Amino acid sequence: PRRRVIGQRKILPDPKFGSELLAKFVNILMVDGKKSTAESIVYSALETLAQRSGKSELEAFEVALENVRPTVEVKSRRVGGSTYQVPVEVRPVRRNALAMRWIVEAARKRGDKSMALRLANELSDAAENKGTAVKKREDVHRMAEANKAFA
Amino acid sequence: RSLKKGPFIDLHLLKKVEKAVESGDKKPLRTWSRRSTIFPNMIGLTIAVHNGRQHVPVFVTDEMVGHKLGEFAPTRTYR
Amino acid sequence: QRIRIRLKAFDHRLIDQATAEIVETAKRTGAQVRGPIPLPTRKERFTVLISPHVNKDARDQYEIRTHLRLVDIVEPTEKTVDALMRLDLAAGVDVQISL
Amino acid sequence: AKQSMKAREVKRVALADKYFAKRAELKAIISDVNASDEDRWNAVLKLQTLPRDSSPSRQRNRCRQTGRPHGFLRKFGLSRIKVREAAMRGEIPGLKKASW
Amino acid sequence: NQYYGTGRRKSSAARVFIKPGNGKIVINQRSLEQYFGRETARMVVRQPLELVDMVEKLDLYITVKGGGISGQAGAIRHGITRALMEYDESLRSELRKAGFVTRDARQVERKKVGLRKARRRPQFSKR
Amino acid sequence: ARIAGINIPDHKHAVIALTSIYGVGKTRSKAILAAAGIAEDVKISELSEGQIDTLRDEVAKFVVEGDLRREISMSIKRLMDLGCYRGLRHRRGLPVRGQRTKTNARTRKGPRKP
RNA sequence: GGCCGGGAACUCAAAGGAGACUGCCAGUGAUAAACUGGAGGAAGGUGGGGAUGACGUCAAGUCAUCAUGGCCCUUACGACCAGGGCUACACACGUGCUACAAUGGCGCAUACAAAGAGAAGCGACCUCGCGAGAGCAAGCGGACCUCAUAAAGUGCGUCGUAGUCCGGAUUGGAGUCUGCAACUCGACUCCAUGAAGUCGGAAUCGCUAGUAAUCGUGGAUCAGAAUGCCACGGUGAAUACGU
């Protein structure tokens, strides 16, 4: 806004584990105010992912996120009558938010049967450095690299 | 319309039909009553039904029984 | 026996005045009463268009409130009942007596 | 509203009040089950000879000060415009502008 | 001896009585797991006893009415906080810092004339 | 399996499979299976010749396929020949049950013609 | 079983009161007005939402609510009646409802609300009908009786990516109720039928929090006739670096 200071809203932690990251992930997955459905889907997905890797659900989740977090991006400027792409850094909260959004968006487009299966497959591919989310990170970094002259 | 109520007819139309049948020969019967049912005792007569401007002649046959008199006289003109 | 009085009005100061009057007249005549009990108020609502011709927004909204009270008399006497029947209160309250 | 429409309404109310009982009796005959199966027919043929304006469904509510056929309220017997005028003048007990 | 608390949230009201010993919870003549089938509701109802380490030292008798699952759980939490305050009177600082002492005064916003909802407008066109 | 002059799918449940006949819906299908004594979630490929013949005998009690088609065609032709309001609508190609025509009516009209 | 004797504690009902004022603490600033932060507190700096519309602008809208200057018609531009029309249909535009599906469709059984209306009215229990309904008849001018059974949710089964166990336009047969009267032109029920449609070109709209999105419930007009309008509650987000 123009003359405002916006505080932070309090977010409850997860009921099974105790993380706020997982709560934010549930929130980004939910549709139409149906939180129980999203919780069920996420718990099923994490359960199926833990067996494929023999490590804890939280550790697998963090491993998946660390390969999707971005570092730099491009904004649009127009002062000389033309559109320029200006590279900027990304701050941590935005890094996490963008990673989560890209993971869910990639999962929804897959062709497996159930949403839990789609999410599990997408997370495993991300942990191995494959999939549309990782391709998106690559594209963003490429565009930011091709414009370092305007920094 | 409910079956426990019987069919609906106008009293004056019923009386006119009875008189025509009993007295034999008839010329067309003029009527403004488009909401009346067609009874079996009308077969063979000619009823002229109102449509807003004119009276349209309907020669009653046995496939028309049970319908209302107004379904054989359209009200709107279109080409 | 037992007597029940129901009072209704559009104005709560009027209703309270009348209730206190009834309580005092019952207590002075040698009886016992069970104090007035407030009962839920009724709110009726209306909504109208305020232009003689087409402007579908631009409405007004009105309300009428109906206040209600109940009083009970437990051990009456002939003089008390006659005194109650021979009384008149303000001209905006409705009183109903059940024996 | 024209002066003839109000007269029409008055006539309708009069006839509907005049013929109230006859109609109720005939309708009870027609409706009641286990009737003669011929009295029903006769009552059906008799109900339609009474005047048309004796059916209470031929009546239309109107404002009691102007005759308007639209925007009627039943508690007040008036239309919206007259309701508002009286309310602002203070001629309807208990009524006032509301907020919540 | 008993200790009492009253709690309120969106449209719900909750009465709570607490006594010492052998932690058992009864709500509307049923157990916690039978009444609330939601893990979020269970966690909310249990938060303050976990905060102040008295989970297995107090019996709780509770009644509630109005609202829905989340509102009832929140009202119960408020009531338990107040009852614990009555019981001890030195846990107020910790409960306040946790945030359980505040009444959450968020209600539903009314519908307004000319709008489809409290804040939603109909579609607009220039031409 | 051939039932009423047609083949019906063999990998579905019976209650779904029997609706491939023209004139048999969900309710009639349930009635047929109840009268024949076969469960509803049994595949048609897990049955026997005697059971299939029982089904044939039960299905024979309704009007289906060609007979029903002839019935409907005669129904419509009657009105068209009689020349009532409904018949005129039928042979003009417009709605019959009193729907609007200023807009819509595209299921009976077809796509637009400029 | 709040069923019964009782009790006046609590939830709730509705009348009188208390409370929030930059009042207290530190720093900044002109020995100011104010500003950033902290304590206690249910709530903090306009705590949230309503009502409340300055002098004037557009010869803006309304002589068909009503009233009114000037014109105009009086065996007619004024009465009365039955039938028809305002519902037409090659086409163009605005506002909405239902969908194109596994965060789903269908079957069984099981929690948790708020706010309203009712005597030419609201119509329980029981019997008959697959059903819309019908028959006989208590109670209530109502914190007591009735409308009235919340839904999304949760548990257990099945469907396995197909124009399908997705969608429900059209059309044929058989009925119910209101009403003198349902052809033109009503709403609803049963059996059968089973269209377009797989997320929408150039444009373009709403919303900063108990909001958007999604789920049900009530009223006015009213013999009958809402996907519109006016109200009520359940679940419940994302984001704001900056001009």
A135/E contact by beta carbon, under 8 A = no
What residue segments make up the domains of chain C, in order of their start?
Answer: 2-99
Q: Can you tell me whether residue F73 is helix, strand or coil?
A: helix
In strand G, the nucleotides that come within 7 Å of a protein beta carbon are: 10-15, 40-43, 47-51, 61-62, 65-66, 78-85, 87-96, 102-104, 111-117, 120, 134-135, 142-143, 150-154, 158-161, 165, 169-173, 175-186, 190-195, 204-214, 220-223, 229-243
Say which residue the tokens 């013609």 belong to: F113
Give the containing element (helix H, strand E) for E13.
Answer: strand E13-20
CA gap A117, A108 in Å, rounded: 11
Q: Which of E24, E90, E33, E18 is nearest to E56 (CA)?
A: E24
CA gap A150, F94 in Å, rounded: 66
Q: Can you tell me whether residue A15 is helix, strand or coil?
A: coil
Task: Pinpoint the alpha helices (H) of D1-100.
Answer: 3-18, 20-31, 39-47, 80-89
- The tokens of C53 are what? 């011709």
- In chain B, residues with a C-beta closer than 8 Å to the C-beta of D33 are 4
> Which amino acid appears at position D73 of this protein?
L
**Contacts with B15 (C-beta within 8 Å, 6 or more apart), sequence order:** none
Expressed as residue numbers, the domain containing D43 is 1-90
Contact indicator for C62, C32 with CB cutoff of 8 Å: no
Measured in angstroms, what separates residue E126's CA from nucleotide G95's C1'?
Answer: 14
Question: In CATH, what class is C2-99?
Answer: alpha beta
Expressed as residue numbers, the domain containing F48 is 2-65
- The tokens of A143 are what? 């565009």
Establish if D97 belongs to a structural domain: no
Contact indicator for B72, F83 with CB cutoff of 8 Å: yes
DSSP string, chain C: --EEEEEEES-HHHHHHHHHHHHHHHHHTS--EEEEEEEEEEEEEEEEE-SSSS-SS-EEEEEEEEEEEEEEE-S--HHHHHHHHT----TTEEEEEE-
Expressed as residue numbers, the domain containing E122 is 1-127
Contact indicator for E42, E32 with CB cutoff of 8 Å: yes
Report the CATH number at residue F28.
1.10.8.50
Establish if D26 belongs to a structural domain: yes
Alpha-carbon radius of gyration of chain E: 19
CA gap A26, A37 in Å, rounded: 10
Contact indicator for E17, E2 with CB cutoff of 8 Å: yes
**What total of structural domains would you count in chain E?**
1
**Contacts with E9 (C-beta within 8 Å, 6 or more apart), sequence order:** E67, E70, E71, E72, E74, E75, E78, E104
Measured in angstroms, what separates residue E5's CA from nucleotide G9's C1'?
Answer: 13
Measured in angstroms, what separates residue A3's CA from nucleotide G29's C1'?
Answer: 22
Do the chains contact at D44 and B11, CB–CB below 8 Å?
Answer: no
Identify the experimental approach.
cryo-EM
Measured in angstroms, what separates residue B6's CA from nucleotide G186's C1'?
Answer: 20
- In E47-122, at which residue ranges do the beta strands (DSSP E only) sit? 58-65
Do the chains contact at D45 and B11, CB–CB below 8 Å?
Answer: yes
CA-based nearest residue in chain C for residue E113: C57
> In a 10 Å sphere around its CB, with 0-12 CB exposed, 13-18 middle and 19+ buried, how is residue F104 labelled?
exposed
The three-point CA angle B69-B70-B71 to 5° equals: 95
> Which amino acid appears at position C68 of this protein?
L
Contact indicator for F79, F86 with CB cutoff of 8 Å: yes
- In chain D, residues with a C-beta closer than 8 Å to the C-beta of C8 are none
**What total of structural domains would you count in chain D?**
1
E39/A contact by beta carbon, under 8 A = yes
Domains of chain A listed by start with CATH number: 20-147 (1.10.455.10)
CA gap A42, A120 in Å, rounded: 9
The dihedral sign for the CA sequence D82, D83, D87, D88: negative
Establish if D98 belongs to a structural domain: no
**Displacement of CA E10 from its chain's centroid (Å):** 9
Q: What is the resolution of this structure in A?
A: 2.0
Question: Please, which residues bridge with residue E62 across strands?
Answer: E16, E27
Question: Please, which residues bridge with residue C69 across strands?
Answer: C7, C38
